[PDB]
Every structure is written in structure tokens, then in C-alpha cells.
Amino acid sequence: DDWSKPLPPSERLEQELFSGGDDIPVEATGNNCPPHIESFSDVEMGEIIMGNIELTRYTRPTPVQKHAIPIIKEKRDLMACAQTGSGKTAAFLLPILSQIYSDGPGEALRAMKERRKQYPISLVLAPTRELAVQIYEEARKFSYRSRVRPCVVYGGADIGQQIRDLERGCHLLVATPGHLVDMMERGKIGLDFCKYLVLDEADRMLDMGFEPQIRRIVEQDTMPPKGVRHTMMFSATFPKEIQMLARDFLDEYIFLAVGRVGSTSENITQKVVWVEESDKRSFLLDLLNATGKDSLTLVFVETKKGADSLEDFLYHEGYACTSIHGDRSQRDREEALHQFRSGKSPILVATAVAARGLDISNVKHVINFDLPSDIEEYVHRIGRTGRVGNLGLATSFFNERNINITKDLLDLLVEAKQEVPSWLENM
């Protein structure tokens, strides 16, 4: 079974997949970095990949593709810092799929050929359903006329059909961490033969609360260790927790910096206002009355009974809202999520612990009704808003109960080049 020979073409499938169609400074750091290429033909990618690249009508490799692709093709771990929209997806999908076409399905899967559990060769983790579907559809384009079969698992109403497509064969799996863990405990996915692990938008994944699930997938199961598996991490920022995750997950990696890379999100506006406890409700009402149309707002409160009280207050003032917290049943929490995702209830009151690991995406305004006691968790909360194109907003209510975080909060506002309240510097 030759996995480099392209299968016969399907003119029907071609029309479905292919119907569409500069010098950012790059800094590489590491031991013996393979040199960047200038065109896709500068590396033998194979008959299948070259043929699919021509079908996508995209022939000039992006800067991040110029450096990341030869690093992966030389079986080297990669920690790349690039913003969403630079071509990260193809940068890891193309060399991974090219090597699988040369190596074949390995000896383990070949022996196993003679509800069926699937053992993917490549695992790609993503924070959101939106990005998971995007990576999946690109993988379909680059596995055309190939024997590699990609799948995606991201939950939602059609998770039953996603479990189905798994059982039709899966060599490359795109998933969000929480649903992948569920697939693993249900005996539908095994990682014993995963040779390629990709963590895309890893800073966002940790912001959404997925780190326990990710370390469960990567360290506490049957995935081959670093030095056997080839691992790639992409992340727009490089904070200390991403440093530590790279150090744990990567083996003698190359660090790639596309553009001005920092540790804060340069796509978030942070407003900190002093609000006493008894004034927080009136202040929130003023913020919400400035909220536009189709604007998903996430309000963090400290306790379940606080999310309890606030949602009751907001609904009786006429606001379309919902709440997720521990004192609500499972079914009520899944419906709260759907109404938030659909925009029927665009204001979601939640405790931070209840929102961790939930399919919450496209948040435009993060409101810290109550602030946390760690600057680490604060960074996590506001990371739920902001994107490469849209500037997110993070408003926080601050009073005497938050003097512990004063110094850390001021240092973060200055580093992010945000407005610093003149009072904050004094306490």
C-alpha cells in the first residue's frame, strides 16, 4: 500500500473542496535551525501535496510557512509565535501530511488492518469549534487523492454524527480538549500511535481553562513521549505558563517569532474603575446600556449565589440574559450555553470555575463584576475577548477588596500599554 501515489481523482469532490482564491521580520532561536525556504518546491513534499497546493491556487508560502515548514520536515519540535491570519494552519498541516505520505501508516496500523476504536497518527488541538472546523476543512483540501482521512470532534448538536465519522476511519484528528478527553474515556480514541501533536492557539486554550485536559491528553495517557512524537505549539503570545508548557511538551525545540511578540494581548482594551459593592449593579446597568447589537457579554462573579442574585436582577430589569453556575442542573447549563452562543441571551453571568472548559467563543465584552485574587486568573478571563481583527473590551470593578492584586494589576496595564487609573498607582 503506497501512501505517496495519489488515488484516482473525483471531479465531484474537487469542485466541493477548491472553489476559492509580506515581509514580516522573523526571528528563530534554537540549536541547528534548518534554513527557511522561499518556495514550496524547495523541499520535496511529494506528488500529493504539490498537486493539492496547485488546486488551492495559493502558491507563495507565507513568512511563517517559510520557516516552520522546513523545521517540521526535518523532524524538529517547533514553538512558533504567530498571529491568527499568518497561515499557521498550512504551516503545520503541509509538512505533517507530506511525511505521512512517505512513511505510510506505520507498522502498528498496518498490522491492525487484518464501534471500532480509532488510533490517529496526528492530533491537532484547538480551543474553539470555529477554529477546529477551519483546521479540519484545510486538512480535507490537503488530503485529497490521499489515503489519510481527517476527522473533527467539537461537540454541539451533531456530536452523534461526529462520533460516526470517527468510526469510518481517522488518521488525523482535530479536536477541542474537553471533547477529546470524553472521546477517550468512552473508548473511541486511542493515542498509542500518535506521531504528530499540534497545539494551535495554545495561549487561548489555557485562557479557556483547558490545561488539565491538555496535560491529561498529552502526559497522563498512552501518547508517545517527546523525542518519539513530533510536537508543534502555535501561540500569539508567550507568557510564563506557555513557556512552562513548551518546556514540558517540546524536546530541543526551535523558537519562531513572527512579528512583534509579547506576553500580553495587544488586542484588548482594559478599563479599571473604582466601584463600591452596593454600586456595582447600577454601574453594570450603565455598561450594558452602552452595549451595541449582537455583542456577546460575559460577566464574571465570585460565587454561585452571586451569579444567582445577579441574573435575577438583570432579567427583572428587562435584559435578555442567562447564567451558568454550580447550583444549576446539567440540562439548564447546556441550554444557557446554547442561548448565549445563538445570541438569544447575549449576556452570560457565570463564575470563572463554571466557565472553564466550556465551548464559549466570540465574546466581545468581558466584565469582571468581581475581581479574582490572582493576576494569573485575571489574564485568563480577559483572554476570552479580543481577536486579530476585532478589539475586545475588558472592564473590571475594583474596590478595597482587591488591594492584594493592586501592584500586579498595575504592572500588567503598563506592559499592555493600557490606560492606568491615576489612583491605582497610589495604593
Swiss-Prot record:
Outcome of swapping residue 98 to A: Greatly impairs phosphorylation by TBK1 and fails to synergize with TBK1 in IFN-beta induction
UniProt miscellaneous comment: Encoded by an chromosome X-linked gene which may escape X chromosome inactivation in females. DDX3Y, its homolog on chromosome Y, is located on the Y non-recombinant portion.
GO biological process: cell differentiation; cellular response to arsenic-containing substance; cellular response to osmotic stress; cellular response to virus; chromosome segregation; cytoplasmic pattern recognition receptor signaling pathway; cytosolic ribosome assembly; extrinsic apoptotic signaling pathway via death domain receptors
Effect of substituting residue 72 to T: In MRXSSB; loss-of-function mutation affecting regulation of Wnt signaling
Keywords for this protein: Acetylation, Apoptosis, ATP-binding, Cell membrane, Cell projection, Chromosome partition, Cytoplasm, Cytoskeleton, Disease variant, DNA-binding, Helicase, Host-virus interaction, Hydrolase, Immunity, Inflammasome, Innate immunity, Intellectual disability, Isopeptide bond, Membrane, Methylation, Nucleotide-binding, Nucleus, Phosphoprotein, Ribosome biogenesis, RNA-binding, Transcription, Transcription regulation, Translation regulation, Ubl conjugation
Effect caused by changing residue 282 to A: Impairs phosphorylation by TBK1 and fails to synergize with TBK1 in IFN-beta induction
Entry-annotated residues carrying Phosphoserine: 39, 41, 98, 122, 282, 295, 309, 323, 373, 396
Region (Interaction with CHUK) location: 6-30
Protein name per its UniProtKB record: ATP-dependent RNA helicase DDX3X
Section covered of the full-length record: 134 to 574 of 662
Highest rank taxon of the organism: Eukaryota
Region (Interaction with HCV core protein): 262-427
Reaction(s) this enzyme catalyzes, per UniProt: ATP + H2O = ADP + phosphate + H(+)
Annotated crosslink Glycyl lysine isopeptide (Lys-Gly) (interchain with G-Cter in SUMO2) location: 73
Domain Helicase ATP-binding: 69-256
Subunit field text: Homodimer; can bind RNA as a monomer and as a dimer/oligomer. Interacts with TDRD3. Directly interacts with XPO1/CRM1. The interaction with XPO1/CMR1 is dependent on the DDX3X nuclear export signal motif and XPO1 interaction with GTPase RAN in its active GTP-bound form. Weakly interacts with TBKBP1/SINTBAD. Directly interacts with TRAF3; this interaction stimulates TRAF3 'Lys-63' ubiquitination. (Microbial infection) Interacts with hepatitis B virus (HBV) polymerase in the cytoplasm; this interaction may inhibit DDX3X interaction with the IKBKE/TBK1 complex, and hence impair IKBKE/TBK1-mediated increase in IFNB production.
Function: Multifunctional ATP-dependent RNA helicase. The ATPase activity can be stimulated by various ribo-and deoxynucleic acids indicative for a relaxed substrate specificity. In vitro can unwind partially double-stranded DNA with a preference for 5'-single-stranded DNA overhangs. Binds RNA G-quadruplex (rG4s) structures, including those located in the 5'-UTR of NRAS mRNA. Involved in many cellular processes, which do not necessarily require its ATPase/helicase catalytic activities. Involved in transcription regulation. (Microbial infection) Facilitates hepatitis C virus (HCV) replication. During infection, HCV core protein inhibits the interaction between MAVS and DDX3X and therefore impairs MAVS-dependent INFB induction and might recruit DDX3X to HCV replication complex.
Region (Involved in stimulation of ATPase activity by DNA and RNA, nucleic acid binding and unwinding and HIV-1 replication): 108-114
Cellular compartments per GO CC: cell leading edge; centrosome; cytoplasm; cytoplasmic stress granule; cytosol; extracellular exosome; extracellular region; ficolin-1-rich granule lumen
Residue ranges occupied by any Helicase C-terminal domain in the UniProt entry: 267-427
